[PDB]
Structures are given as structure tokens and as C-alpha cells.
Design an enzyme around this catalytic site. Structure first.
Site, mmCIF file in Angstrom:
data_model
loop_
_atom_site.group_PDB
_atom_site.id
_atom_site.type_symbol
_atom_site.label_atom_id
_atom_site.label_comp_id
_atom_site.label_asym_id
_atom_site.label_seq_id
_atom_site.Cartn_x
_atom_site.Cartn_y
_atom_site.Cartn_z
ATOM 1 N N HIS A 41 1.858 -25.875 67.468
ATOM 2 C CA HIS A 41 2.695 -25.778 66.418
ATOM 3 C C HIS A 41 2.676 -24.900 65.735
ATOM 4 C CE1 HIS A 41 -0.487 -25.797 62.979
ATOM 5 N NE2 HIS A 41 -0.658 -27.639 63.610
ATOM 6 N N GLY A 143 -5.842 -22.811 57.993
ATOM 7 C CA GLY A 143 -6.332 -21.757 59.193
ATOM 8 C C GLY A 143 -6.979 -22.514 60.405
ATOM 9 N N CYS A 145 -6.856 -25.049 62.217
ATOM 10 C CA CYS A 145 -6.179 -26.090 63.682
ATOM 11 C C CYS A 145 -6.702 -25.451 64.308
ATOM 12 C CB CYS A 145 -4.238 -25.828 63.002
ATOM 13 S SG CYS A 145 -4.180 -26.997 62.081
HETATM 14 C C1 LIG Z 1 -3.363 -25.895 60.894
HETATM 15 O O1 LIG Z 1 -4.575 -25.367 60.353
HETATM 16 C C2 LIG Z 1 -3.447 -27.317 59.085
HETATM 17 C C3 LIG Z 1 -4.553 -27.553 59.280
HETATM 18 C C4 LIG Z 1 -4.623 -28.733 57.612
HETATM 19 C C5 LIG Z 1 -4.259 -27.589 56.543
HETATM 20 C C6 LIG Z 1 -5.018 -28.631 55.236
HETATM 21 N N1 LIG Z 1 -6.493 -29.081 56.428
HETATM 22 C C7 LIG Z 1 -5.028 -29.595 57.573
HETATM 23 O O2 LIG Z 1 -6.844 -30.384 58.045
HETATM 24 N N2 LIG Z 1 -2.472 -28.041 59.604
HETATM 25 C C8 LIG Z 1 -1.071 -28.145 59.102
HETATM 26 O O3 LIG Z 1 -0.900 -27.590 58.620
HETATM 27 C C9 LIG Z 1 0.000 -29.141 59.701
HETATM 28 C C10 LIG Z 1 1.323 -29.129 60.659
HETATM 29 C C11 LIG Z 1 1.280 -29.972 61.221
HETATM 30 C C12 LIG Z 1 0.754 -30.560 62.450
HETATM 31 C C13 LIG Z 1 2.470 -29.650 62.616
HETATM 32 N N3 LIG Z 1 0.361 -30.081 58.496
HETATM 33 C C14 LIG Z 1 -0.393 -30.830 57.770
HETATM 34 O O4 LIG Z 1 -1.727 -31.025 58.110
HETATM 35 C C15 LIG Z 1 0.196 -31.693 56.510
HETATM 36 N N4 LIG Z 1 0.477 -32.753 56.591
HETATM 37 C C16 LIG Z 1 1.312 -33.573 57.185
HETATM 38 O O5 LIG Z 1 2.167 -32.907 56.779
HETATM 39 O O6 LIG Z 1 0.941 -35.425 57.257
HETATM 40 C C17 LIG Z 1 2.131 -35.594 57.004
HETATM 41 C C18 LIG Z 1 2.458 -36.363 55.895
HETATM 42 C C19 LIG Z 1 1.899 -36.972 54.810
HETATM 43 C C20 LIG Z 1 2.659 -37.460 54.377
HETATM 44 C C21 LIG Z 1 3.556 -36.756 53.939
HETATM 45 C C22 LIG Z 1 4.161 -35.472 54.311
HETATM 46 C C23 LIG Z 1 3.655 -35.275 55.908
HETATM 47 C C24 LIG Z 1 -0.755 -30.690 55.727
HETATM 48 C C25 LIG Z 1 -0.413 -29.511 54.965
HETATM 49 C C26 LIG Z 1 -0.240 -32.083 53.852
#
Ligand SMILES: *[C@H](O)[C@H](C[C@@H]1CCNC1=O)NC(=O)[C@H](CC1CC1)NC(=O)[C@@H](NC(=O)OCc1ccccc1)C(C)C
Ligand SMILES: *[C@H](O)[C@H](C[C@@H]1CCNC1=O)NC(=O)[C@H](CC1CC1)NC(=O)[C@@H](NC(=O)OCc1ccccc1)C(C)C
Lengths: 306, 306
Positions: A41, A143, A145
Site C-alpha cells: 500500500h 509512518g 508500516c
Molecule cells: C502505515 O504506516 C500505517 C500504520 C498504522 C497507522 C497508525 N498505526 C498503524 O499501525 N497503516 C495504515 O495507515 C493502514 C493502510 C491500510 C493498510 C492499507 N491503515 C490503517 O491502519 C487504518 N486502519 C484501518 O483502515 O483498519 C480497518 C478499519 C476498521 C474500522 C473502520 C475503518 C477501517 C488506520 C489508520 C485506522
């Protein structure tokens, strides 16, 4: 003596962290030989995020769309490919700091160290377990990931985890290094839930042995139980079932302390049924379940790594 | 999100660990530039232990009596000297892995990472605090002496601890890198006791802010208190006094959460007086006191190190 949540030394992993930037997105990559592994991603923009097609997004990409930075050195990306949820960026330079490694896929209950990183730079290291519900209770900000989890076997780094995402109970989901998620999660900004977790029973017993080894005995008892009657108690308290191989794996700890596994089970039963009565075990007022039997033996026997 | 006991990445410290052997004694040394620092009781034999005179024992020694091993490379010792409870072994080769470093003496309540080593090889890394009674709750076996405690600040390793001994409550005592012990302890095999410990109040409050930052709010309340009335409560529960400097240090966390420091003290008050009623905070059923305010900001803001 003493018992601490102990991570593996992180130095062989720190030498593999790079920064990967594509468009408006920066995250961490793992640089082994001439390949940089990172979460696919990275190729995503904030509107792609709700339901992306990564195959289409990747074919839209050129090698020059990827900024891979190893400190203050830019690696030239000379190829790329996607394996499940990970990107593999071929670069023209093999990492001279590449340790002996493999990619392993761990089992729930197993532990590993996480080297949390931002912009390719290590921020800290900590010990995690793969929960029975295939999440981990990590510490990850935007950041982070591409930070990885790993165990070490003498000189060999076994990479088992790469971080992708945070679920809304504040728990974390990711993949092995072949790109396959632990658990049913997908790398999509769509509503997903972890599902009910359970306590890792074999790890709790291992931690109780650690306690006895360090002279913490207040919880034991005269009693014993059978595997079946113990497991009927595990059911009530949302503990995962104890198997004979679990018993077999606890043998060494059983032999060193002289406390039968089923006797330790009887102690765990009384702890479950009555609580700890305002007391602590190894500095916790909770029954701790992210130490494996090997974790306990390593820490109490001083196994080192080269 | 999430909150973990996070150690600093241990890579730059691993590159300085060596093995030092004198007579029948092997422990760890820290190799910086052309100097190897280690516990002076390496020159001790099983009968010197009881009441030793280290300045006679050292003048007995010759440079060749010290085997310093940097992996599978023996360093030639070309000079030696004793600084308080540390030996400085002058060797003919400067460590090419020497980081920017500095020797600091830390205050009680401050935290650091320990890289536990045996035979000059790292075994694991974990996070400790200097307790108010100048012991640390470490995880150390025979062989571990010379293992060091450190913090990292950008690119610079601040070495603050070298391990020397275990006291009979299973807690540990050591020196700074200038060989001065923390606390009243001496490197002799004679009866010594840690003395009553207290809880690091400012760290408990910082950890409560960490909890709020991570969405763990159940313990908050409507009430406030004054620094004096709070400290009368800290008194009863064996908590360190809270200073205005402590309040000032908690300001940023107060600012980010919007919870006045004295409001958090009122929450801590009432947690002290009723307990937690079967609930947890950040995965613990105890009030945790080895996160400093800086630890909380670092981990909750993603500060990295190069
Ligand atoms: C990459 O650095 C990052 C790490 C996250 C950010 C904060 N702590 C972490 O572990 N990952 C992301 O931003 C990912 C990208 C998607 C994987 C492609 N998104 C998330 O982690 C989001 N979570 C999410 O969408 O979970 C599913 C969900 C559940 C309920 C409602 C909406 C979505 C985070 C930013 C909420
Ligand atoms: C160095 O490798 C080693 C580390 C110890 C061993 C086990 N756990 C540790 O952290 N240190 C020692 O063996 C030192 C050497 C003396 C420092 C010169 N000794 C101890 O740690 C002993 N502790 C001790 O004598 O405490 C004082 C005391 C208290 C009560 C009764 C007698 C003595 C250990 C081995 C008991």
C-alpha cells in the site's frame, strides 16, 4: 535472576531498514541482498484507499516512481514485483549488511521482537506475541508500516512479520515476509474487526515456571489435575486449550523446577478461580501470556546470539 | 497507537561488546575507541570476593593476564588502570564501530535500555528504570556483568549503567561508566540490602497520560487536587513526592491531552485509594512507574534515531 520482557538485539535488523517513498507516501522497507521488501500500500493514494486494486495501481508504476533511501544514500530501483501484500523492489545494490536470514510464518502464541521504525530509522524494539486472533498488541504510529518482527537463531534472523495496519481496538495487523496476512485481514481502508481474543495458556504456564525459577512461589499448591479437567476450566476463562504437545514442550521447565505440568495447571486453575488476592507474580498483577516456553528458557539460561 | 515497554535499538551498543577474561573469570567489556571498560571484579578469584582489596589485586596483574576477545579476534591489552569500580583496559586497536557516545550518570526515576550479554555476545535488550533506592529490576545471570545500560539521543549513545551484582531480593546493582555505584552498594560478596523502594510518582502520571493518549480513559474523574493534598496521599502509599518541576515536566502531556496535571493527580489519588476494581490500564493491572514523561512522548510521537 529477574524476568523482563526481553527483545532480541536489533542490530542485524537495523542494518536492513530503508525508507521507501512513492508519490505522497513514505514507509519503511527491508533491504536484503538486492531486494527491498515493503507493504504494497505504499503505492496507494489516500483516495485509492477505500477499495484499491493493487494490480492496476502497480502496472501504473515505473521504477523511478519509487524513492528508496538507505540513510543518506538513494538506491536505484531496477525492477519491481508484487507478492501478495508485499512489494519487492529490485535495486542495483546488494545490502552489504545483509545477515543470514529466512522468512518464517509464525503460529499464534509465538513471540517475536518488533523493530519499530519511521522514515527508515529505528525508533525502538519490543517483544510481541501473535495473538490467537492473529493480531498483535504493538506500538505503531503513522509512518511505522514496513517495520518488521523477527526472531534470531544463533546468527540467523528469522523475519516473521511486517506491519501494515491498525484496527480500531488499537491492535495491529500485518503479514509475513511473503505478503500473506496473519488472520482474515486485508490491506483495505474498510471496516474490519479483530474478533474475540483468547489467552495463550501454554505461555501462561511457561511464565508461571519462570516465576518459580526466580523464586516466586506463592501461587503453587498441593493439588494436581488432569489435562481434561484443566481444559474444562480453560473454557470458562477464555483460555486456549492445552495440548499434550504443549505439555511435552513444558517438560524441560517442568524438569528444572520439579513441578509437574499438571501440577502447574492445578495452580493456574486456582489463580483463575480466585484471582491473585492483591498479589503479584514477576511484577504483574495479571497472568502474563506473551512468553513462550523457549522465551523462558532463553532468558533464564542466558542464550546469546552471534 | 498502543503502548509497549520499548527499548532503544541496540545495534550501536552490540558493536562495542567484548569478552574479558582474567584468570578463572569471564565477563563483558565495553570497547570504545582504544579502551575496554569492565567491572574491576574480573580480577577477583573465588576467595577474593569476600572482602577484596582491588588496588593490591590490580598491582598483581600484568597486561597479559587480561584476555579481551572481540568475537573471534583477540585484542592486545597494552595498559590498564582502575577508575573506582571499573577497569579501563588499554588495547592496541581502536574499535572501528565506536559510536558517538558519552558517559552520563542518571537520576532515580530515569529509564534506560539494558543490553544483556554473556561472553561478549548480546542475549537480549530490555527497558529498566533506576529505582528510587538505586537498584534496577533487571534480568541478569552469572556471566552478565559488564553488560551496559544506555539511552540514545539522535546519533549519540549515552551510557549510564554497567552491571555488577545481584542483591538477595533478586534486584540488581551497578555503576555508571566512571565506576561509581548507584546507591550505597560496594562490589563485595558481603551482606547488603537494597532498602525500601518507593513508586516513581511522576512516571506513574506520565503513564496515565500515555493511557489517555491511547484512548484508555476509565480512570479519569471530575475532581482536581492541590500538589500538597496529593502529596499527603503519595505519602501513605509509598509514592515519591511530586515536585513543581515534575508538574512542569508533565506540561506537554497535559497540553496534548487537555488534562491538567492536578486533575491527573486527582485520578491517581482515587486509584490509590480504591484500586482498579478489576480493570486494566494499558494492559496492566498495576500502576506502572518505569515510563518517564520523555518515554511517553517519544513512543507516542515516533521519535527515531540515526
Ligand atoms: C502505515 O504506516 C500505517 C500504520 C498504522 C497507522 C497508525 N498505526 C498503524 O499501525 N497503516 C495504515 O495507515 C493502514 C493502510 C491500510 C493498510 C492499507 N491503515 C490503517 O491502519 C487504518 N486502519 C484501518 O483502515 O483498519 C480497518 C478499519 C476498521 C474500522 C473502520 C475503518 C477501517 C488506520 C489508520 C485506522
Ligand atoms: C557478574 O556476572 C555477576 C552478576 C550477578 C550474578 C547473578 N546475577 C547477577 O546479576 N556478579 C557477581 O557475581 C557479583 C560479584 C561481586 C560484585 C563483586 N556478586 C553477586 O552478584 C552476588 N551478590 C552478592 O554478593 O550480594 C551481596 C550479598 C547480600 C546478601 C548476602 C551475601 C552477599 C550474587 C552472586 C549473590
Amino acid at each position: 535472576s529477574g524476568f523482563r520482557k526481553m527483545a532480541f538485539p536489533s542490530g542485524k535488523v537495523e542494518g536492513c531498514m530503508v525508507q521507501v517513498t512513492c508519490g505522497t507516501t513514505t514507509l519503511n522497507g527491508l533491504w536484503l541482498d538486492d531486494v527491498v521488501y515493503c507493504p504494497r500500500h505504499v503505492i496507494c493514494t489516500s483516495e485509492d484507499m477505500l477499495n484499491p486494486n493493487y494490480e492496476d495501481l502497480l502496472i501504473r508504476k515505473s521504477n523511478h516512481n519509487f524513492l528508496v533511501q538507505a540513510g543518506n544514500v538513494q538506491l536505484r530501483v531496477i525492477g519491481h514485483s508484487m507478492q501478495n501484500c508485499v512489494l519487492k523492489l529490485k535495486v542495483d545494490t546488494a545490502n552489504p549488511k545483509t545477515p543470514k536470514y529466512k522468512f518464517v510464518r509464525i503460529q499464534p502464541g509465538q513471540t517475536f521482537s518488533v523493530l519499530a521504525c519511521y522514515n527508515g530509522s529505528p525508533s525502538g524494539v519490543y517483544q510481541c506475541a501473535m495473538r490467537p486472533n492473529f493480531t498483535i498488541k504493538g506500538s505503531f504510529l503513522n509512518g511505522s508500516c514496513g517495520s518488521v518482527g523477527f526472531n534470531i537463531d544463533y546468527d540467523c534472523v528469522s523475519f516473521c512479520y511486517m506491519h501494515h495496519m491498525e484496527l480500531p481496538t488499537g491492535v495491529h495487523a500485518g503479514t509475513d515476509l511473503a505478503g500473506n496476512f496473519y488472520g482474515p485481514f486485508v490491506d483495505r481502508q474498510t471496516a474490519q474487526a479483530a474478533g474475540t481474543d483468547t489467552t495463550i495458556t501454554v505461555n501462561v504456564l511457561a511464565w508461571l515456571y519462570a516465576a518459580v525459577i526466580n523464586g516466586d512461589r506463592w501461587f503453587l499448591n498441593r493439588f494436581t489435575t488432569t489435562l481434561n479437567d484443566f481444559n474444562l476450566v480453560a473454557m470458562k476463562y477464555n483460555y486456549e486449550p492445552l495440548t499434550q504437545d504443549h505439555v511435552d514442550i513444558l517438560g524441560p521447565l517442568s524438569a528444572q523446577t520439579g513441578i509437574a505440568v499438571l501440577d502447574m495447571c492445578a495452580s493456574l486453575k486456582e489463580l483463575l478461580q480466585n484471582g491473585m488476592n492483591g498479589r503479584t507474580i514477576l511484577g504483574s498483577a495479571l497472568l502474563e501470556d506473551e512468553f513462550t516456553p523457549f522465551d523462558v528458557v532463553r532468558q533464564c539460561s542466558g542464550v546469546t546470539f552471534q
